Design a protein around this ligand. Structure first.
Ligand SMILES: NC(=O)C1=CN([C@@H]2O[C@H](COP(=O)(O)OP(=O)(O)OC[C@H]3O[C@@H](n4cnc5c(N)ncnc54)[C@H](OP(=O)(O)O)[C@@H]3O)[C@@H](O)[C@H]2O)C=CC1
Ligand SMILES: O=c1ccn([C@H]2C[C@H](O)[C@@H](COP(=O)(O)O)O2)c(=O)[nH]1
Ligand SMILES: N=C(N)NC(=N)Nc1cc(C(F)(F)F)ccc1Cl
Lengths: 219, 325
């Protein structure tokens, strides 16, 4: 059948959402649901400060590669596009997101960094990164690159547009079980387009419990 | 891949999925079975519910309701990582905390709990209940030599719920707190409520037989043995109850809580709870909340309701395990 772009190019999303300060629905008799966790950022940075464990998780997922699986992936993408070291993953982020990262981490290590922007061009960056002004360009770029998996580390605006177009094969979602002030949020996942298939162990880090759940695009 | 086939052979004696007992319908747990990885700790609880429905034995019981049952299960909860208050349904802890403080004081007076609007023991203290237990000379709500009495006065002769049992009987609690404090490697740190001699004098025998503690690297772990476990109504609270108890003991002994281990003996599911559990098993767990204890409390006896705070409890909606309307 008509293979989906997100499937051919293994394009996933990964994020961490905390609970929003919905003033006064806050005391009991409050209803909870998956959308309870939607707080992504505040003031161009993270609502909660930094979460060590969440970070360990982020780096672990976005840098992990399986060399023995590439050949299979190469063949897939080639056949798709009508064709015939150190494998790396690709991370795609919005410009705002790229700037909110401390210089010491830019560009994200052991990862092919791709930034989405209209106000900036390659001449405005000093780092080893790819710049693109259209989502369609990411696809062209992916078709030309050697990589394992592609991760949309987002920016709320980025997450939003990649979900509408159905470019996400799975969502690695981190539920920060605490509340902070926020100004940007993750889109409300439609229980019909995506369904949770895995829920991890629960942990404590930086004074808050959290877990990791994996959403998957339904058939 | 040669191992692959040997695995298949080694299962030559696992017969057909028809003699899998209790005619269970898959469709009732689609969401539950769809899940690939179920690592959230709440699944230790849910998985048992599933096992008991799918492989449980049909038995009758002291009540007549009829239950499905299995024997011998174990759950482990990491209190240094979270507070295990189930999320697939709503739970309140005010009651079980008042009950716990009530145990610690060695009380056996049900009125004390009822005056705090905690009815956990109300049914076990009525004239009828007491009389059916043959405790004709027992005043209404005088529960008898139960938990509290055994924890502070094991061995002492029970008179009534108003008596003063000071320096009478063995004060186990006091004893275990001393053992953890001064002899942390002791393999004799147990709290026992199953006083064989006083069983018939109790409103009813205790379900939580004993607790054993373990201390290592400044961390306290607890194992509690439950003889009779009501997966639908009881267990959720039992888990919470002892997790809180482990925190308290851990604190007054200058240690950090670690593992709370729950050993289930007769683990049963009341037939009249099945529909509600089906519903529940299809709900995905939310991350557990946390428990905060006033740190200034240094004595196990100085705790009060306001010294306990549960934070960030995200849970599905309330469920009556016995739905009618
Ligand atoms: N909790 C979490 O897991 C995460 C939180 N965050 C937080 O999110 C906030 C940032 O998110 P948000 O403000 O939504 O910003 P984004 O990171 O989504 O950046 C949006 C910007 O990226 C560019 N862009 C997006 N789509 C396109 C496109 N199709 N073509 C060209 N350029 C595009 C534009 O740059 P330009 O303006 O140059 O045109 C745009 O205005 C911060 O507070 C950050 O801390 C970020 C990542 C993860
Ligand atoms: O803390 C408690 C107290 C009671 N029960 C349940 C177990 C049984 O269903 C019933 C007691 O019946 P017997 O075991 O006494 O027969 O109460 C619990 O699960 N937890
Ligand atoms: N933390 C997550 N699971 N999500 C996430 N996308 N975060 C995240 C984190 C970082 C930083 F910590 F390295 F600065 C940078 C960019 C993103 Cl998109």
């Amino acid at each position: 059948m008509m293979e989906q772009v997100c499937d051919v190019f293994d394009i996933y999303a990964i994020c961490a959402c905390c609970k929003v300060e919905s003033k006064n629905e806050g005391k009991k008799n409050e209803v909870f649901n998956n959308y309870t966790f939607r707080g992504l950022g505040n003031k161009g940075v993270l609502p909660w400060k930094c979460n060590s464990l969440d970070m360990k998780y982020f780096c672990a997922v976005t840098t992990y590669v399986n060399e023995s699986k590439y050949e299979k992936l190469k063949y897939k993408r080639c056949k798709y596009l009508n064709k015939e070291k150190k494998l790396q993953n690709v991370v795609v982020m919005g410009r705002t997101s790229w700037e909110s990262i401390p210089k010491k981490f830019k560009p994200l290590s052991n990862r092919i960094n791709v930034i989405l922007s209209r106000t900036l061009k390659k001449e405005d960056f000093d780092e080893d990164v790819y710049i693109i002004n259209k989502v369609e360009d990411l696809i062209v770029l992916l078709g030309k690159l050697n990589y394992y998996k592609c991760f949309i580390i987002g920016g709320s605006v980025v997450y939003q547009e990649f979900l509408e177009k159905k470019l996400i094969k799975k969502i690695y979602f981190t539920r920060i079980n605490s509340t902070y002030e926020c100004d940007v949020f993750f889109p409300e996942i439609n229980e019909n387009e995506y369904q949770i298939i895995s829920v991890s162990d629960v942990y404590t880090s930086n004074n808050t419990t959290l877990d990791f759940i994996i959403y998957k695009k339904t058939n | 891949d040669e191992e692959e086939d040997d695995f298949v052979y080694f299962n030559f004696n696992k017969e057909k999925e028809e003699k899998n007992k209790n005619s269970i319908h898959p469709n009732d747990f689609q969401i539950y079975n769809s899940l690939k990885y179920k690592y959230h700790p709440e699944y230790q609880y849910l998985n048992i519910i599933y096992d008991i429905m799918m492989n449980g034995n049909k038995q009758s019981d002291r009540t007549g309701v009829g239950v499905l049952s299995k024997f011998g299960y174990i759950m482990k909860f990491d209190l240094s990582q979270y507070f295990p208050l189930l999320t697939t349904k709503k739970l309140f802890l005010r009651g079980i905390i008042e009950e716990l403080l009530w145990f610690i004081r060695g009380e056996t007076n049900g009125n004390t709990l009822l005056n705090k609007n905690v009815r956990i023991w109300e049914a076990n203290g009525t004239r009828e209940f007491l009389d059916n237990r043959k405790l004709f000379h027992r005043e209404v709500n005088d529960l008898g030599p139960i938990y509290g009495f055994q924890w502070r006065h094991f061995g002492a002769e029970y008179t009534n719920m108003y008596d003063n049992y000071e320096n009478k009987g063995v004060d186990q609690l006091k004893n275990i707190i001393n053992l953890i404090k001064n002899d942390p490697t002791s393999r004799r740190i147990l709290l026992c409520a199953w006083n064989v001699k006083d069983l018939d004098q109790m409103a009813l025998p205790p379900c939580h037989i004993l607790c054993q503690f373990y201390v290592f690297d400044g961390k306290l772990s607890c194992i509690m043995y439950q003889r009779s476990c009501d997966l639908g109504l009881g267990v959720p609270f039992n888990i919470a109850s002892y997790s809180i108890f482990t925190h308290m003991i851990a604190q007054v002994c200058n240690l950090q809580p670690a593992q709370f281990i729950h050993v289930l003996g007769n683990a049963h599911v009341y037939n009249n709870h099945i529909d509600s559990l089906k519903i529940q098993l299809n709900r995905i767990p939310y991350p557990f909340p946390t428990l905060k204890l006033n740190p200034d409390i240094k004595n196990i006896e100085d705790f009060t309701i306001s010294d306990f705070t549960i934070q960030n409890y995200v849970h599905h909606e309330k469920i009556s395990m016995d739905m009618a309307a």
